Design a protein around this ligand. Structure first.
Ligand code: HYP
Ligand code: HYP
Ligand code: NA
Ligand code: NA
Lengths: 310, 310
C-alpha cells in the first residue's frame, strides 16, 4: 500500500538504506530539529524501514532531507535498530555514492548537513568518498572498568560523531568467526559502564563500544558494538574518528599521517586528521557499492507492518 | 552491473526472496535436477542473493522456475544461508502471494513443482494460502539424546518436506526474548545428533531442530533452528507437517482435525492432515504479505559481490 523508495548500499560490508521518498514530512528546521520530530511523531516509520521483516538488526537507515543551507547538496538523519545516530561515516559514504547512482550529483566536493553538524564529502574519480567529519576529541583517558568475566580493562571515552569507549587491553580475538564472543564481551562492557554511571561530556550516553588489536595488513583491526547490539561490518567512520583523537592525544599520530583501519570482516578505511586551531578534524576515505534499488511496501493488513520485536 | 529482480515478502515474519529474473539458466529438467545444477555450477548466486550484504542470515530464497508439467503454474527451488531446502511451507505461501502481486495468477488452485515433489496451493479470497504438502511421516520415535550441560531429552525424527528432530521435554522457555538461549540449545541438540550418528531415512541429515511447548492461545508454540543456524520466524510449514505426522502416529490427532501452531514470535498457521492410502497429507494455511519490490545490483568492483562470510 504505502511505499518507501530506497537505495540500499553497503560500505565495506555495512549496509545503508537511503530513504529517498515516502517518509513523513518533518518540516524545514535543522536536521537536529527534524530528528526530534521524526523520533517523537514517526518512530514507527524508523521501525518499518530497518527492523525485521522488511529490514534486519544490522541495517542502518539514512533519511535523505532537503538541507537548510543553500550550498549544501543534502541533509541526512541516520538511524538503526534501537534509535538514532549522530553522524555516520559509513552511511555518509553510502549516501554520496547513492546520490551519484541516482544521477543527482557528480564527482567533486559536497556539503552534507547532519544532526551533529555539516560534513564535507568528496566523491573521487574512483568513486570512493572522503568524509571530512565533525571535530573529534578525547574526553577521558584510561578509565578503569571491572568486568566480572575478565577483570579490569581500561578504555578511552571519546567523541567521533557518536560517543565511543575504546579498549586495547581486552585480550579478545578479533575476527569474523568470533563475533559471538566479541558481542558478549562488548555488551558486558556497556553494562559495566552503565553500572558505574560512566558517560561522555554532559552525561552523553556511551552507546558504541570498540575494541582494537594489531593487524598484519593494517595499522589496526577493530570490533564495534553499535547501540542496538549489532556489530559494524565496516571499520566504523565515527569510531575511527574517535580513535584518531585518542592516538593524537597520546602522541602516536601527527596531523596528515595516514592510519589504515581494518574491520572485523577485513574491509578497510584510510584516515588522517587535520588540525584547525584547537580542533582535530578527522578525514576518512572508503568505498560504498550499490546493493539494491527497492520500494518497500507497507501493507495495512500485515500484523508486522511497523516491525517485529520489542 | 548484473541485476537480480525479486519480490520480497514474509510469512508470519519469516522472509522469502522470490527471484523472478536474473539467475543463470538451469536447463529444462525437474526441479531436483535444476537444484543439482544451481548448487554445483552457480552456488555463488545463492550467496549473492541471500547472504550479507545484499541479504541476511535469516533470509530464505526462492528461485521461480518454468515447470515441466503443463498443468503447473510454477516450479521453485528454495535456499538459505547455508545451502538448499527441500520443500518450504512459508516460502510456498510467499511465492503464491507474490505471483498474485505480480498479476500472474488469480485466486484458485495452483500446482507448484519443487525438488521433493509437486504441491497444491489454494489462494483464497482473503489472500491466505492453503498448501497441500508432500506426504509426511515419522521415522523414529522417542530417540534418547544426552545433552551435556542440559540433561537428557527424547525426540522424534520425522519428514515434512525437510528432516526434523522434534522435542517436547526440553524444559526451555519459548519466547522471542529468549531466542539466544534457544539457538544455543538447539545447536547443542544438532551437535549431539551428529555425535551419535543419528539420521533420517537413508542417512538423511537432520538439519532442522524444533522444540514445542504449550501456548495459551494455540495448540502449541515452537522454536525451529534452520540448517544455517537462523531460526524460523514462522510456525514452519514443513516442521508443522512433520509435527502432524507425529501427533497422528501417537493417536493424538485424527484426519481433518484442526491444529493451531504458533511461532516463537507469535505468528500462527492452522493445519490439518488428510489420509490417502497409507499416506498422510499435511495441509497448512497461512498468509504472506509483500515486503518490497527490489532489483539487487551486482557490482563487479564490489569485494563482497558474491557475499560475505565463510
Ligand atoms: O561508520 C559509522 O560511523 C557508523 C557508526 C555505527 O553505528 C554504524 N557505522
Ligand atoms: O516453512 C518452512 O517449511 C521453512 C523451513 C525452514 O527452513 C524455513 N521455513
Ligand atoms: Na599492522
Ligand atoms: Na493451548
Amino acid at each position: 500500500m504505502k511505499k518507501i523508495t530506497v537505495i540500499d548500499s553497503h560500505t565495506g560490508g555495512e549496509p545503508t538504506r537511503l530513504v529517498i521518498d515516502g517518509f513523513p514530512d518533518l518540516g524545514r528546521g535543522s536536521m537536529a530539529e527534524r530528528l526530534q520530530i521524526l523520533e517523537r511523531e514517526h518512530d514507527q516509520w524508523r521501525r518499518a524501514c530497518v527492523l525485521e521483516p522488511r529490514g534486519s538488526d544490522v541495517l542502518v537507515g539514512a533519511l535523505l532531507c532537503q538541507p537548510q543551507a543553500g550550498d549544501a547538496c543534502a541533509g541526512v538523519i541516520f538511524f538503526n535498530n534501537s534509535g538514532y545516530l549522530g553522524m555516520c561515516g559509513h552511511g555518509t559514504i553510502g549516501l554520496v555514492r547513492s546520490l551519484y547512482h541516482l544521477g543527482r550529483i557528480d564527482q567533486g566536493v559536497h556539503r552534507i548537513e547532519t544532526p551533529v553538524g555539516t560534513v564535507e564529502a568528496t566523491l573521487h574519480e574512483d568513486l570512493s568518498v572522503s568524509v571530512r567529519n565533525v571535530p573529534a576529541y578525547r574526553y577521558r583517558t584510561q578509565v578503569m572498568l571491572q568486568l566480572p568475566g575478565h577483570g579490569k580493562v581500561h578504555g578511552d571515552i571519546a567523541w567521533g560523531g557518536n560517543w565511543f569507549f575504546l579498549i586495547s587491553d581486552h585480550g579478545q580475538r578479533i575476527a569474523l568467526d568470533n563475533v559471538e564472543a566479541l558481542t558478549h564481551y562488548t555488551r558486558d562492557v556497556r553494562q559495566a559502564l552503565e553500572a558505574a554511571g560512566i558517560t561522555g561530556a554532559e552525561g552523553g550516553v556511551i552507546d558504541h563500544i570498540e575494541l582494537f588489536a594489531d593487524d598484519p595488513q593494517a595499522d589496526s583491526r577493530n570490533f564495534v558494538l553499535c547501540p542496538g547490539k549489532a556489530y559494524d561490518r565496516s571499520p566504523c567512520g565515527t569510531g575511527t574518528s574517535a580513535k584518531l583523537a585518542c592516538l593524537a592525544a597520546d602522541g602516536k599520530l601527527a596531523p596528515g599521517q595516514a592510519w589504515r583501519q581494518a574491520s572485523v570482516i577485513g574491509s578497510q578505511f584510510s584516515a588522517h586528521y587535520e588540525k584547525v586551531g584547537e580542533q582535530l578534524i578527522p578525514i576518512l576515505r572508503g568505498s560504498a557499492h550499490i546493493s539494491a534499488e527497492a520500494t518497500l511496501l507497507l501493507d495495512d493488513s500485515d500484523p508486522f507492518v511497523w516491525g517485529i520485536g520489542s
